[PDB]
Amino acid sequence: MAELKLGYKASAEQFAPRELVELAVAAEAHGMDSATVSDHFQPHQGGHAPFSLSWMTAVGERTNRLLLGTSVLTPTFRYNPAVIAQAFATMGCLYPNRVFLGVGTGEALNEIATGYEGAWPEFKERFARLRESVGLMRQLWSGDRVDFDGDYYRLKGASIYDVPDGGVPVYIAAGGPAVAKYAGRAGDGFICTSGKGEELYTEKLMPAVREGAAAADRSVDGIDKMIEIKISYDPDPELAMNNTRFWAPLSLTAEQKHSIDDPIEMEKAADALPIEQIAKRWIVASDPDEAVEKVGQYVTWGLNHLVFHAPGHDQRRFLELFQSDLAPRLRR
Amino acid sequence: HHHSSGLVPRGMELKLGYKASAEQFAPRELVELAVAAEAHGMDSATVSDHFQPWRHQGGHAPFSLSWMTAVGERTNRLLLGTSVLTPTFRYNPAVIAQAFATMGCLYPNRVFLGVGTGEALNEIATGYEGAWPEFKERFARLRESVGLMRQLWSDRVDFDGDYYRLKGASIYDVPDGGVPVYIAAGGPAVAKYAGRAGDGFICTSGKGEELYTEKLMPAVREGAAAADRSVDGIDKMIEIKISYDPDPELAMNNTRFWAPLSLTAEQKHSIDDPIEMEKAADALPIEQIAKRWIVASDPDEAVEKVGQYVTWGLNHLVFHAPGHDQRRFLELFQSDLAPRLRR
């Protein structure tokens, strides 16, 4: 649903497994409503990739209220969607009403590295694979026996024996109108990322979600509209600026992010970015009122679940500042 | 004042552990039973990894890797692992390698990867196309997948096998000490492989002395010698199938849930449908099913039959009790059996 939530982005790219879990526990301690993790097989310099589903489970077992999920996981290539259905159904049983599945169309880098053969599929196929996998998983979460024969995936007499009462809510990530519309039509949730220009949110994404919801005769209000807020808020401006540097890959173009299959190629192109250009993606701020005004814009544009990704290694510092300075304002 | 890590290396004593049956219990119960096993003195708990139960009526299948991590966060001492997981079909071996590396970091010196050759009951259901491969290919897939994971574990890795590939792949977060890999073995050719490329082997009870003493053990010695490794580096694990209860009728009848284990090896590895398995399995009378189990109502007969395996060379005894009341079995184990078994 579309009440205001404030959550925390746990960056698997930046931290080792134990630290990544403990940070999410600190996020609960600091009042966050949710925590979400990137799902990567590999991020190199100061790089990490703890297994996302182990992070979800460890934090679940250590926490009481956080909604937990992926932002996002590709359920279409290295991961068998039936096994993903089983994994998240299990987690859903273990942490009732606290689990979601965040899905995307995929990145060449994860999939080529783990053994994908032949040409990296074009966007259209990655989208069709995504749609087909989501329906496959949903049929499985009914808890009945499923026979499935799609263009891409198959099941023969398959059941998930252990299914949560509230099902497994599916959040669909989009950087463009096409998948946003699919999200409005079919998603329990919708995910985007901040910093990419007022136009993308108001002119492409939000109207696409409304279009999809309308098209499928759905209340737009019942879709959780989630966004990862790229915020570099620190009373120390040097840190606010300098903390963004680690995150240069996020400032590469959409096609470099999805299609570069070589991690050497990827780090080169990230390294090529001047910090001033990196920073444009981020809310760089030393004043808490100004920071919240920038975030508040997304709430005006129709987003209701705001998940804060802070760029620096000192995440506990971020959480302290979030709790004392940002959250009271953000709540309103 | 310097504080040390306190971390004790793998460097493995008679161990008594607990089999957590994903086939029989829902996710939360399965976790909580592993916690009570620690509470009751167990050294270890292992979980079966399955997409589907053996049986339909009262069947369950919680995701094994979530069990492992949840139990990890909740326990202090238990060695934890899969007995066993198939890393060759529905699972990508690079992803398995990343999962266990991550778990081994989360739970230092407590995690192992237990692996086997596969059951169609897990793989056909999840979309494997074409006929279910014969044992020779499943074994050869297993061997390759283990090799891939070794190389991935530590560096940027290219791998080009007959089955699995890697391209520029790295695992960043690897545990100090690595990830012990235990191979399920029910013959000398897999037992030899286990000595050569594993850190442990897993067998089951009920197969008879000469399987263990004359087939499995000698083959483990041969594989390790071929690896230039002391055999004392290989943990010798057995799943002890025990139905222990002071009521003999109940100790016998409590095996019915596990009727499918009484079917042939053929049926168990190739039947793809729990409804089908169950129909085959339930036509069998109870005395036939009980044959698969150590059925005992006295601590002494129990400890005599269990102690055979220690005499034949096994050092890691993981107990699988078939009844629904697992907490009774843990209670009975700790008070009646454990003190005699320790020595």
Q: Where are the domains of chain A?
A: 2-332
**Structure tokens that stand for A71 in this block:** 């932002």
Task: Indicate the burial class of A233 (C-beta count within 10 angstroms; 0-12, 13-18, 19 or more).
Answer: buried
- Cα angle for residues A123, A258, A189 (degrees, 5° grid): 75
Q: Which two tokens stand for residue A260?
A: 């570069």
Q: Is A309 a catalytic residue?
A: no
Q: Cβ contact (<8 Å) for B26 and A113?
A: no
Please work out, in degrees rounded to the nearest 5, the angle formed at the alpha carbon of residue B101 by the alpha carbons of A99 and A116. Answer: 80
Report residue A113: phi and psi, to 5°.
-60, -40
Q: Of A135, A148, A246, A146, which is closest to residue A186 (Cα–Cα)?
A: A135
- Of A16, A316, A91, A42, nearest to B108 by C-alpha is A16
- C-alpha A315 chain-centroid distance: 18
- Tokens representing residue B248 in the block: 């003999």
- Residue A152 touches chain B, beta carbons under 8 Å: no
Q: Is A115 on the interface with B (CB under 8 A)?
A: yes
From the number of C-beta atoms within 10 Å of its C-beta (0-12, 13-18, 19+), residue B176 rates as exposed
Residue A289 burial (CB count, 10 A): 9
Gap between the Cα atoms of A41 and B95, Å rounded: 7
Q: Which fold has domain B1-343?
A: TIM Barrel (3.20.20)
Please list, in sequence order, all residues whose beta carbon lies within 8 angstroms of the beta carbon of residue A110, skipping any fewer than 6 positions away.
Answer: A40, A41, A42, A74, A77, A78
Q: Do B125 and A158 touch (CB under 8 A)?
A: yes
Closest CA to B201 of B175, B239, B151: B239
CA distance A94 to A77: 26
A87 with B65: Cβ contact below 8 A: yes
A45, A76, A114, A132, best to mutate vs chain B, most B CBs in 10 Å: A114
Q: Does the annotation place A110 within a ligand binding site?
A: yes
Strand (E) or helix (H) holding A171: strand A170-173
Residue A269 identity (one-letter amino acid): A
Q: How far is B87 from chain A (nearest CA, A)?
A: 12
For residue A235, give every residue at least 6 positions away whose Cβ sits within 8 Å of its Cβ, in sequence order, or none: A286, A321
| CA gap B150, B101 in Å, rounded | 11
Give residue B97's region: left, alpha or beta (phi > 0; psi -120 to 50): alpha
Gap from B158 CA to chain A (nearest CA, Å): 8
Q: Is B99 on the interface with A (CB under 8 A)?
A: yes
Answer whether A278's CB lies under 8 Å from A251's CB: yes
Spell out a b/e string for A1-15, using b for 16 or more CB atoms within 10 Å of the CB, else e: eeeebbbbbbbbbbb
Resolution limit, Å: 1.9
Tokens encoding B245: 């209860």
- Residue A146 has phi, psi (to 5 degrees) of -120, 125
Tell me if B101 and A49 make a contact (CB, 8 A cut-off).
Answer: no
CATH superfamily of A2-332: Luciferase-like domain (3.20.20.30)
